[PDB]
Amino acid sequence: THLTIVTEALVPTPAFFPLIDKLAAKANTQLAIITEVLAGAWERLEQGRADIVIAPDMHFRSSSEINSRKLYTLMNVYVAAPDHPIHQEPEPLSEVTRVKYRGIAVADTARERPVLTVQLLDKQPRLTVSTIEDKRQALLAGLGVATMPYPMVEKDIAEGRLRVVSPESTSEIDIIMAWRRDSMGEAKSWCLREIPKLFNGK
Amino acid sequence: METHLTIVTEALVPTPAFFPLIDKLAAKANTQLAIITEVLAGAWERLEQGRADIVIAPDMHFRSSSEINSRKLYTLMNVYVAAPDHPIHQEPEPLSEVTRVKYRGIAVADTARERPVLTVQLLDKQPRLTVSTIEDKRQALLAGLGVATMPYPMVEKDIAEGRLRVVSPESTSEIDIIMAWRRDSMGEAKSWCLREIPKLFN
Ligand SMILES: Cc1cc(O)ccc1O
Ligand SMILES: Cc1cc(O)ccc1O
Ligand SMILES: Cc1cc(O)ccc1O
Ligand SMILES: Cc1cc(O)ccc1O
Ligand SMILES: Cc1cc(O)ccc1O
Ligand SMILES: Cc1cc(O)ccc1O
Ligand code: NA
Ligand code: NA
């Protein structure tokens, strides 16, 4: 009756919207598309509270009978407001410089899945937010410097609301679909074959 | 030496409204601010469990503990909305329980570790989409996927330019957004915020 899909914060939830009407005709399933951050997504899969997870490769979640499949590559870019002082700096990535300016991070579950944004060191000003929306607005308001998935800020860079601080730092991340094998129902199986079709060419 | 204050802004409350604090707080003390989003009961659970210094959330009509002091910030207007071409608009009595079951609700998952709430009426045998963030709920509504309440400020532009349409004014409700905190703990940064945040919504 109920399927839960977990789309990690980096993954746009509305990309999964086409499924909804199809899923309602396919089964009497009430859908939940739930957002989690980093380790939270895999914690949900371990605790049997999430049927399918769409999340970056994050080192753990290792359980009994867990399968995966790669969907697409996502580009993360270090960004900041155009008139943020970091842009006038000669060596923005120098440890001496980075500590001066405030990092922006998104909260997650109590680890269990060893990864960091690798965007902020210690003894350095930090703002923590729960959602990518808060993070984008904080960046737009010139309140700090942080990574962002390129698609969500492509328009912002185009119209000069944000500016990439240094392209060398930009990194690529695999977005993967994972699930557990021990239970494999009609709706869950159907989605497992349908979700990759959403990102053919991504 | 630095200092860490954690503020919870419930989903209905715009996190960027609290941005003015950040630069002031950094010059006032070495205080690192953390502005976390929770949903419904989740915000209050955080205050009870001593994991949140200040809570900005709707009045949840729960026995106001002595240990929680609260102060009203502003009134928020919630509007029952749907896409302009959603069938609900042609319906004579949209709010009738018989009618509401026909159409799909859109709900935001209560972040409570203890129990969720019946906020969305939890109409049984009724199609539902559940999402974690108010943005995803907005997009679901924009895509004409169902019917749900929304805080007017977030959708004001959408109603103006006819991307969303108020289904029935009778359903419109006003909610008090309140600031709550605990008496057992006080310090420089906490006290400073408690006096500064109300000025943001004078
Ligand atoms: C728009 C958007 C794009 C994306 O690639 C990830 C998250 C988002 O919210
Ligand atoms: C809203 C949305 C943003 C996006 O980048 C891809 C698909 C979407 O539905
Ligand atoms: C690494 C990373 C994680 C995340 O949750 C959002 C953006 C990011 O760049
Ligand atoms: C922008 C915004 C305004 C608001 O009044 C509530 C939530 C929001 O995300
Ligand atoms: C940015 C912002 C949006 C809003 O809807 C209300 C207050 C605000 O400061
Ligand atoms: C109506 C409503 C109120 C709320 O506080 C959170 C989500 C909601 O859908
Ligand atoms: Na999302
Ligand atoms: Na928020």
Out of B154, B159, B175, mutate this one to test ligand 4's pocket (max ligand atoms within 8 Å of CB): namely B154
* φ/ψ of residue B123, rounded to 5: -50, 120
State whether A10 and A38 are in the same domain. Answer: yes
State whether B84 and B16 are in the same domain. Answer: no
State whether A150 and A186 are in the same domain. Answer: no
How far apart are the C-alpha atoms of A49 and A47, rounded to whole Å? 6
Chain B environment of A13 (Cβ under 8 Å): 131-133, 136, 139
Q: How many CA atoms lie within 13 A of A162 on its CB side?
A: 29
- Is B112 buried (19+), middle (13-18) or exposed (0-12) by CB count in 10 A? middle
Percent helix, strand and coil across chain A, each rounded to 5?
Answer: 30, 30, 40
How many domains, in total, are found in chain A?
2
The CA–CA distances, whole Å, from B51 to B25, B34, B43, B185, B196 equal 20, 12, 10, 12, 21
How far apart are the C-alpha atoms of B158 and B171, rounded to whole Å? 18
State whether B182 and B116 are in the same domain. Answer: no
Q: Look up tokens 């963030």; give the residue.
A: B133
State whether B67 and B130 are in the same domain. Answer: no
- Contact partners, residue A62, CB within 8 Å, separation at least 6: none
Q: Look up tokens 């990690």; give the residue.
A: A8
State whether B187 and B128 are in the same domain. Answer: no
State whether B81 and B149 are in the same domain. Answer: yes
Handedness of CA B124, B130, B132, B138 (dihedral sign): negative
State whether B10 and B49 are in the same domain. Answer: yes
- Write out the H or E segment, with its range, that includes residue B65: none
* DSSP type of residue B66: T
Q: Where are the beta strands (DSSP E) in A17-59?
A: 30-36, 52-56
The range of the structural domain enclosing residue B53 comes to: 3-75+176-200
CB distance B37 to ligand 6 below 6 Å: no
N- to C-terminal Cα distance for chain A?
31
How far apart are the C-alpha atoms of A32 and A187, rounded to whole Å? 13
How far apart are the C-alpha atoms of B149 and B81, rounded to whole Å? 6
CATH of the domain at B26: 3.40.190.10
Closest residue of chain A to B107, computed from CA coordinates:
A32
State whether A55 and A27 are in the same domain. Answer: yes
Chain B environment of A129 (Cβ under 8 Å): 15, 34-37
Yes or no, beta carbons of B19 and A143 under 8 Å apart: yes
Atom of ligand 3 nearest to the CA of A76: 9
In this complex, which of A17, A125, A134 lies closest to B16 when CB atoms are compared?
A134
Which residue in B138, B125, B67, B64 sits closest to B97, CA to CA?
A: B125
State whether A82 and A43 are in the same domain. Answer: no
CB distance A106 to ligand 3 below 6 Å: yes
Interface of A with B (CB under 8 A): 13-14, 17, 20, 24, 30-36, 102, 107, 123, 125-131, 133-134, 137-138, 141, 143
State whether A134 and A92 are in the same domain. Answer: yes
Token readout for B114 is 């203890």
State whether A92 and A59 are in the same domain. Answer: no
